[PDB]
């Protein structure tokens, strides 16, 4: 507080929130920045100068809380300041630029926070010499304090691979973080891989920014890069591999993703299909070349329950290979306990994380700081939406009025079956039937998401068009997928948690949700990203269409609000629709007669 700040009569609910004690600079017209020192928040104008230069700086040193079109709510965090000094930045420069572009005097607590969040950059480093995690620090000053720490037990010494994660968490805790910047040009102990950036690949500007933020020194800075759906994370990884030119391993959490990224990699880089050996229960071949790649999903390394000897040979081979680069695509699942064996198993130097969503239910997402590193780059979602790099969606949330026909049983149903009982409302069937009619009238490919296989198959059978879920085999689901894509008999399909994420299905510009998870925001966000990567995200007059059929009179409204609040905070609003269009103009309605409603009620009473 640069004032006396005598408490105002209107500042009672302003529990240290009345931010008028600051002496506002007369350059408030030009400068775009406020500071909120009560919570560390930052208030940023979208209509004053210096904001274009300050946007990347605020992303680097701060995190945004909320970014609508008019005012961006940012927040300096120690995580973001560590990311800033890891990119290469410092407290004094941050304070100087902040006072240069700030309308307001710089707060003492913020000054102290940025002073504290300055790391020993360059002091603590680790290298791998013949699959051995050598902790090579620049001084014995590091060795004294680290041996002063009880966990541990120029100059380089060994720390065990499972102990590497624990000691990385510990050194982050004592705020002595390690930078992992591989000198792949200087290191020739690893086999260099003759892969070249083909002229057929040219890079987007924000992707070039993402590379150069972690290629500022020419070394590969290890961390996270968060890019939206369809941004070209495969292209970014291909460019990083081609400019590293070493043995590289990338694991993604689907065998379909294994197939698709293997063909993407052999397409847009000069690595050879001989050098790429694909590992799965389809085939477990190995490449015998000095340099190349072996791809598998996380399952064929995590599992030890039912493993083949050829799988054992392959995992032995990858254990033997000292890789120079690792990318954990869809990094939201690898910090799970059966999945966080990556450092314990794979000897790889540079650790990059590419994913769409950097959020989850628990705090395992912050473990990537001592698993792979901080966020090296992020692309602004609404900026790419207006840039056409991702889509523009007219989301329409459908508040289906609850039928008492199903509510009478739903209220007296037990808890494990209440969910399946209120998913299956005949009014919801009626609304879905007219919505499918109306969007096939508009000529839009529609994908329907249900959390339950029986509800998915019942909706699919009432449509007369097939279903795909997690228990459907791969051959049947791809047959149904190609039937949907090319065959005009299959105009719409019925997808599930194999369709929510980790697939490339951007044709469906229309999406209707009949069910979802209880509170998993990431499933809903990935379902939105399924159509955010749509092909017609660039044409004029485009707005994608998202629909969520949710039953009234439940907790499902609060559930959907919880699942949607991340997208609302992103900028993907959820508009209110209760009275739909064309409710009786459709002649035939699914389970329209009350006898039909009681029929479906006792049909689902057979299970519930």
């Amino acid at each position: 507080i640069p004032a006396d700040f005598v408490p105002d009569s209107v500042s009672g609910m302003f529990r240290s929130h009345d931010f008028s004690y600051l002496r506002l600079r007369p350059d408030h017209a030009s400068r775009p920045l406020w500071i909120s020192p009560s919570d560390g928040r930052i208030i940023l104008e979208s209509f004053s100068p210096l904001a274009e230069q300050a946007q990347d700086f605020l992303v680097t040193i701060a995190e945004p809380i909320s970014r609508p079109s008019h005012i961006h709510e940012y927040k300096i965090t120690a995580y973001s300041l560590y990311a800033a000094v890891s990119v290469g930045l410092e407290t004094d420069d941050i304070i100087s630029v902040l006072d240069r572009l700030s309308k307001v005097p710089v707060a003492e607590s913020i000054i102290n926070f940025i002073k504290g969040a300055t790391i020993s950059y360059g002091k603590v480093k680790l290298v791998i010499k013949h699959n051995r995690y050598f902790v090579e620090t620049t001084q014995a000053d590091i060795l004294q304090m680290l041996l002063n720490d009880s966990v541990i037990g120029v100059h380089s010494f060994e720390i065990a691979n499972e102990s590497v994660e624990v000691v990385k968490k510990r050194c982050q805790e004592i705020d002595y973080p390690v930078l992992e910047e591989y000198d792949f040009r200087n290191d020739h102990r690893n086999p260099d891989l003759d892969i070249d950036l083909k002229p057929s690949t040219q890079i987007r500007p924000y992707q070039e920014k993402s590379l150069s933020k972690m290629f500022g020194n020419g070394r590969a800075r290890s961390g996270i890069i968060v890019l939206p759906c369809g941004a070209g994370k495969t292209l970014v990884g291909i460019t990083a591999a081609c400019t590293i030119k070493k043995s590289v391993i990338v694991l993604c959490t689907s065998s379909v993703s294994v197939m698709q990224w293997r063909q993407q990699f052999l397409q847009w880089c000069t690595l050879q299909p001989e050098n790429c050996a694909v590992f799965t229960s389809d085939n477990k071949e190995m490449f015998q070349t000095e340099s190349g790649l072996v791809v598998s999903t996380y399952s064929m390394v995590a599992n030890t329950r039912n493993r083949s000897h050829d799988s054992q040979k392959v995992m032995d081979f990858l254990t033997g290979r000292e890789w120079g680069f690792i990318i954990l695509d869809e990094v939201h699942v690898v910090p799970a306990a059966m999945f966080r064996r990556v450092v314990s198993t794979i000897a790889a130097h540079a650790k990059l994380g590419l994913t769409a969503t950097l959020v989850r239910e628990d705090d395992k997402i912050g473990d990537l700081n001592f698993l792979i590193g901080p966020k090296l780059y992020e692309a602004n979602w609404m900026e790419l939406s207006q840039k056409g790099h991702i889509a523009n969606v007219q989301c329409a949330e459908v508040w289906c009025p609850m039928t008492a026909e199903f509510y009478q049983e739903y209220l007296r149903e037990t808890a494990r079956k209440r969910m399946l009982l209120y998913i299956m409302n005949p009014t919801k069937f009626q609304a879905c039937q007219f919505l499918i009619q109306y969007h096939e009238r508009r000529g839009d490919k529609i994908i329907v998401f249900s959390d339950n296989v029986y509800a998915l198959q019942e909706y699919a059978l009432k449509m007369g068009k097939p279903f795909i879920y997690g228990s459907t085999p791969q051959q049947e689901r791809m047959n149904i997928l190609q039937n949907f894509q090319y065959n005009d008999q299959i105009n719409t399909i019925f997808l599930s948690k194999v369709g929510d994420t980790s697939i490339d299905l951007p044709e469906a510009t229309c999406l209707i949700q009949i069910s979802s998870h209880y509170g998993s925001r990431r499933q809903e966000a990935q379902r939105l990203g399924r159509i955010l990567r749509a092909k017609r995200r660039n044409d004029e007059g485009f707005n994608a269409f998202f629909y969520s059929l949710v039953s009234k009179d439940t907790q499902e409204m609060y559930y959907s609000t919880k699942r949607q609040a991340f997208l609302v905070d992103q900028g993907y609003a959820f508009k209110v629709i209760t009275h739909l269009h064309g409710m009786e103009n459709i002649p035939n309605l699914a389970y329209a007669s009350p006898r039909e409603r009681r029929e479906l009620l006792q049909e689902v009473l057979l299970k519930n």
Partner: protein, 445 residues
């Protein structure tokens, strides 16, 4: 309904009391300002000739397209006893009130005013520095007192008693505190001249004999008064309530010379903008307005963050919404504030969407809410989800026989205002327990 309320009050005022009010030119000038354009034209035409007219000449002059409006004007004219329409020679012979006529004539000619426009001293000073500043001070004190945010300068005991008695900003004696009624929030929503007129209507209603016509004539000349001059301190009842409205901060009186501030002018007449707010689906407030009064009134129903020069920011919470709801403050009052605080870019976008949806379908199969329902209906859905029930308590008559008890005594009960509910087919209708004035009398027949 300000002119409606004042006209209704003057119609409640009897004919000769009205004629007493029509005696003085300042009162006649203010009342002429109140009259609608047609009657204003009629009286300015007839005021300069002592020729009474029959109704037939006026009817022949009047174009029949606005005949309803003509009927409204002449209905006000007759019901105020400003007219003397008598069926002389079989024809409804039209006659203006003659005292009103001559006092208007003298006011227009600048003739005999008897200082009804004001017993003038004409010692003019600066008003922006003393009168406007003291006026803004006293009005700020009473305004934040009405808000409920703490302020030391309490109002007068007369207005304090009027608030205690009245249903405006209830000084609940069990709590000992002024409390925001729904009528209090109506007063908050009101325009400033509306607030002044409601205050004077309530004070005139409560005040009795203090001569009522003296208060009336003094109020009319006080509205007629001009800023920044000294004047003679007149009737003594007028003088003592003049000291009362001095304590309200309306006039800057040096205990005989008094200096009327700008509030008399606003009482007489009114005089990306300020007060324009950008709505947000994230409920964020982008106000193009700032005042400590603005923050004080926004504290009642909006969760705010900080105060900057014109940029008042915040986020509307459902806690703020239900804080408004639990005070008895109406969601219609809330949207009255909201729709009076809209912004140009968003209303242009709303009108563009309206014109887009006009060509597709007339109904559009959408709820009728012109303000963009992405943010606006979220409150309106919360508005419908706020009340969402109907409660009937007390007596109830049930199991009727046939509709002679519905189309004869319950259809008649629509004309007298005694039922709370009406259902012919259920053969029951609900009334309040205390509303049995004329319910158990003709229903027995």
């Amino acid at each position: 309904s300000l002119k409606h309320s004042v006209t209704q009050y003057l119609e409640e005022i009897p004919q000769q009391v009205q004629n007493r009010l029509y005696t003085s030119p300042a009162t006649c000038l203010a009342i002429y300002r109140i009259l609608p354009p047609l009657a204003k034209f009629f009286i300015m035409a007839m005021v300069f000739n002592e020729n009474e007219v029959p109704l037939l000449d006026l009817d022949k002059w009047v174009n029949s397209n606005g005949k309803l409006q003509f009927q409204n004007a002449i209905k006000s004219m007759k019901s105020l006893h400003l007219l003397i329409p008598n069926k002389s020679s079989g024809t409804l012979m039209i006659n203006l009130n003659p005292t009103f006529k001559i006092s208007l004539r003298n006011a227009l000619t600048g003739g005999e005013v008897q200082n009804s426009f004001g017993v003038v001293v004409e010692e003019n000073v600066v008003s922006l520095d003393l009168l406007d500043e003291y006026s803004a001070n006293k009005w700020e004190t009473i305004l934040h007192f009405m808000v409920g945010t703490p302020l030391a300068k309490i109002p007068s005991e007369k207005v304090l008693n009027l608030l205690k008695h009245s249903k405006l900003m209830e000084e609940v004696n069990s709590t000992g505190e002024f409390k925001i009624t729904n009528e209090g929030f109506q007063f908050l929503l009101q325009e400033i001249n509306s607030q002044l007129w409601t205050l004077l209507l309530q004070y005139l209603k409560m005040i009795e004999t203090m001569d009522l016509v003296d208060v009336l004539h003094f109020i009319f000349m006080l509205g007629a008064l001009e800023v920044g001059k000294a004047y003679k301190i007149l009737s003594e009842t007028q003088r003592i309530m003049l000291q009362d409205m001095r304590d309200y901060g309306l006039v800057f009186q040096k205990h005989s010379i008094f200096y009327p501030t700008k509030l008399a002018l606003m009482l007489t007449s009114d005089t990306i903008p300020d007060g324009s707010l950008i709505v947000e689906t994230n409920f964020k407030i982008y106000s193009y307005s700032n005042s400590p009064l603005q923050i004080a009134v926004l504290s009642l129903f909006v969760h705010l963050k900080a105060r900057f020069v014109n940029m008042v920011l915040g986020q509307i919470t459902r806690e703020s919404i239900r804080r408004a709801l639990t005070n008895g403050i109406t969601a219609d009052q809330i949207i009255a504030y909201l729709e009076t605080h809209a912004h140009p870019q968003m209303r242009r976008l709303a009108e563009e969407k309206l014109e887009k949806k006009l060509e597709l379908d007339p109904n559009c199969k959408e709820p009728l809410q012109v303000l963009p329902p992405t943010v606006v209906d979220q409150i309106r859905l919360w508005q419908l989800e706020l009340d969402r029930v109907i409660t009937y308590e007390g007596s109830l008559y049930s199991d009727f026989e046939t509709s002679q008890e519905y189309n004869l005594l319950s259809k008649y009960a629509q004309d007298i205002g005694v039922l709370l509910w009406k259902d012919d087919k259920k053969k029951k209708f609900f009334i309040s327990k205390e509303g049995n004035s004329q319910v158990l009398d003709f229903a027995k027949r």
